[PDB]
Amino acid sequence: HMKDLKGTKTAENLKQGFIGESMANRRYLYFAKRADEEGYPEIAGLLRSIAEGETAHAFGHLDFIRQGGLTDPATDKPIGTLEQMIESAIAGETYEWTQMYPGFAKVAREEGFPEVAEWFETLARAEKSHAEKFQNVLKQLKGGT
Amino acid sequence: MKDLKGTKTAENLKQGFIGESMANRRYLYFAKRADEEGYPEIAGLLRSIAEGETAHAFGHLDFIRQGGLTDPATDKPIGTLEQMIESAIAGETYEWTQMYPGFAKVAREEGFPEVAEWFETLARAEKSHAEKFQNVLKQLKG
Ligand SMILES: [Cl-]
Ligand SMILES: [Cl-]
Ligand SMILES: [Mn+2]
Numbered sequence: 182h183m184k185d186l187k188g189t190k191t192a193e194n195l196k197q198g199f200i201g202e203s204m205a206n207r208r209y210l211y212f213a214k215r216a217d218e219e220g221y222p223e224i225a226g227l228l229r230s231i232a233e234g235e236t237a238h239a240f241g242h243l244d245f246i247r248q249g250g251l252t253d254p255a256t257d258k259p260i261g262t263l264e265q266m267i268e269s270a271i272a273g274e275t276y277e278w279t280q281m282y283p284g285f286a287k288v289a290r291e292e293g294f295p296e297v298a299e300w301f302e303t304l305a306r307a308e309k310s311h312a313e314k315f316q317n318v319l320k321q322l323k324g325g326t
Numbered sequence: 327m328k329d330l331k332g333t334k335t336a337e338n339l340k341q342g343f344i345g346e347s348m349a350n351r352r353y354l355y356f357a358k359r360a361d362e363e364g365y366p367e368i369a370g371l372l373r374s375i376a377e378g379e380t381a382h383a384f385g386h387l388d389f390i391r392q393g394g395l396t397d398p399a400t401d402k403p404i405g406t407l408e409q410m411i412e413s414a415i416a417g418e419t420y421e422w423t424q425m426y427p428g429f430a431k432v433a434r435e436e437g438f439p440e441v442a443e444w445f446e447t448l449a450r451a452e453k454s455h456a457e458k459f460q461n462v463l464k465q466l467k468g
């Protein structure tokens with residue numbers, strides 16, 4: 182019979198699958214740039230085509246998560262409706278600019294890595310801008326205009 | 327070029343890479359819902375912010391590689407193109423030999439046969455990926 186995914190090992194395996202598939206697409210597109218520079222177009226093309234595979238895998242994991250009423254792997258927020266999706270976006274961006282990247286920057290400065298700290302501070306300011314743009318979308322959706 | 331091995335900053339770059347990787351995937355997935363419902367401005371914003379998260383993820387990988395750290399996904403070096411392909415092979419190999427078969431068996435045990443069939447499809451897919459990368463690596467070393 183049909184069962185709730187909530188609290189199951191399968192729910193956790195969909196989450197972990199999503200994380201790994203997300204990383205695989207980013208990794209393969211980064212590796213493709215090195216193949217591009219070095220003159221390996223067949224290798225770059227394969228990396229890019231396999232990366233599209235990993236997009237399909239990630240999106241299918243999110244399909245089962247959303248259809249199963251499970252939460253966003255990144256934020257533990259529901260992602261059933263577009264409004265919920267934007268609220269998930271806002272929650273993650275808010276965590277990143279208010280807590281995560283400032284904390285990473287402080288640790289980098291304290292460990293003697295000022296260039297890395299500056300990068301984390303650039304990202305904190307970027308995620309704040311993202312949060313603001315998503316907040317404006319949510320106003321448009323929630324207000325129905 | 328400063329060595330990051332054994333630091334909390336090394337761990338933070340890894341976690342930042344994971345988060346940025348997920349953000350790009352999430353925002354492109356959300357854009358498809360905006361597409362279906364007729365919100366092209368919202369879809370376009372999601373796609374443009376997703377490009378931001380690509381830039382963030384790649385910059386984390388630059389610091390990882392320049393700081394003597396390993397690939398977040400595989401714990402393998404990714405300095406050279408050959409090392410990058412060997413990292414791809416290692417992660418594909420883990421997924422087809424172990425990770426997705428294991429997920430499929432658990433899904434069938436827990437009574438999720440449709441999810442199990444999906445995991446079985448993915449195990450076969452990652453095996454094909456591993457083989458295609460192996461054919462590349464042989465060409466590079468040759
Ligand atoms: Cl080539
Ligand atoms: Cl719109
Ligand atoms: Mn995959």
Ligand SMILES: [Mn+2]
Binds near residue numbers: 274308311349375378
């Ligand atoms: Mn962001």
Ligand SMILES: [Mn+2]
Binds near residue numbers: 308349
């Ligand atoms: Mn980001």
Ligand SMILES: [Mn+2]
Binds near residue numbers: 231451
């Ligand atoms: Mn793969």
